[model samples]
Target: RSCIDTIPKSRCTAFQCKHSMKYRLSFCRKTCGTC
Candidate 1:
């Protein structure tokens, strides 16, 4: 129910994660999810 993982790794970002979670997408990738 949340985006707390990893993708390409470098593509992830804290801002991205917050953005995804804000929209309820919660599905983050790269550093975003890992962070």
Candidate 2:
């Protein structure tokens, strides 16, 4: 199904931010520049 076709990294961001069911679903979309 398309579910497997699209998946974000089960990871954090420049903020090292953890995630949840809904939150993780809307996590990082792009690099934070990490600068």
Candidate 3:
């Protein structure tokens, strides 16, 4: 299983699939307005 599976999809909406935590975090922080 992926790390994303640990979190709720609603909360992890930054990615559609399993992405690296570093990438996910950066993407969310940059695009989602809040991490």
Candidate 4:
């Protein structure tokens, strides 16, 4: 499975798609997870 499949849409960054690395990093940071 991919990392994108783990995070939710609402947690993703604005102006970015769910699969975007930037969005994933930002979301992880917000959720207190490692980037």
Candidate 5:
């Protein structure tokens, strides 16, 4: 799928997504299902 993590997998963790909403929305949008 086109949806995928832009940042490193390590940085795109559940904790990171939860903690950094901006980062999550940007880099992890697909990973966090925010896309």
Candidate 6:
């Protein structure tokens, strides 16, 4: 399956998606694919 960002695509970058995972996850879970 594919994944997407729950929040804005621009706000969910590789840096934020992984570095800020603790917080970004609340909004970019799909982008982070950490679930």
Clash pairs for candidate 1: 3-26, 5-33, 7-30, 9-30, 12-31, 12-32, 13-32
Task: Indicate the worst ten consecutive residues by lDDT in candidate 4.
Answer: 26-35
What are the RMSDs of all candidates, in order? 5.5, 9.5, 9.6, 7.9, 2.0, 3.2
Report the lDDT of model 1 for residue 18: 67
lDDT of 6 by residue, 1-35 (tens): 44556678777788886689564657777767765
Show model 4 residue runs off by greater than 4 Å. 1-18, 28-35
> Taking the tens digit of each residue's C-alpha lDDT, what string does model 2 give over 1-35?
21221225444443433434333333433322211
In model 6, the runs with Cα more than 4 Å from the true position are 1-4
On a 0 to 100 scale, what is the lDDT of residue 1 in model 4?
27
Best by lDDT: 5
Give residue 18's error in model 6 in angstroms: 2.2
> Which one is best on TM-score?
5
- The digit string of per-residue lDDT tens for model 1 on 1-35 reads 44454345344456666666632243354344343
Winner of 3 and 5 under lDDT: 5
| Candidate with the larger lDDT of 1 and 4 | 4
**Every model's TM-score:** 0.33, 0.18, 0.24, 0.24, 0.62, 0.54
Comparing 4 and 6 on TM-score, the stronger one: 6
What does the lDDT read for residue 24 in candidate 6? 66
Q: Write the per-residue lDDT of candidate 5 for residues 1-35, one digit (tens) a residue.
A: 57778888677888878899887778898778887
The global C-alpha lDDT for each of the candidates, from Candidate 1 onward, is 0.45, 0.34, 0.45, 0.48, 0.80, 0.69
Of 1 and 3, the candidate ahead on TM-score is 1
Could you give candidate 4's per-residue lDDT for residues 1-35 as a string of tens digits? Answer: 23333467565545444455655465444433333
List the lowest-lDDT window of 10 residues for candidate 6.
1-10
**Local distance difference test, candidate 3:** 0.45
